[PDB]
Design a protein around this ligand. Structure first.
Ligand SMILES: CNC(=O)c1cc(Cl)ccn1
Length: 100
């Protein structure tokens, strides 16, 4: 869970991390409530981590991949959020496989 802190901090401070810092506001994003069943962002993961709500690193990795799966589900690959999402997803997978 130490590395979970390291990689979350690096993700939170990443350049392309702007679409995933805060939860998506369904009032502002049309159809998001309908398309995405399990919304997830970095702050939600951050709150769960500080509270200690992560049993294992796998549960952490699950929510991380959930962020990028949700991004790919709702946004186009050539969209601004989509392009930022591909950067963040590749960043996570890379750093995650470095440690483990
Ligand atoms: C992760 N962010 C999104 O999925 C998103 C998508 C759109 Cl269209 C607007 C704001 N946020």
């Amino acid at each position: 869970l130490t590395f979970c802190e390291i990689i979350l901090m690096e993700m939170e401070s990443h350049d392309a991390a702007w679409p995933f810092l805060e939860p998506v506001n369904p009032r502002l994003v049309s159809g998001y409530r309908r398309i995405i069943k399990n919304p997830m962002d970095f702050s939600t993961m951050r709150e769960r981590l500080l509270r200690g709500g992560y049993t294992s690193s796998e549960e952490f990795a699950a929510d991380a991949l959930l962020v990028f799966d949700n991004c790919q589900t709702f946004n186009e690959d050539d969209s601004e959020v989509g392009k930022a999402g591909h950067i963040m997803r590749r960043f996570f997978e890379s750093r995650w496989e470095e440690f483990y």
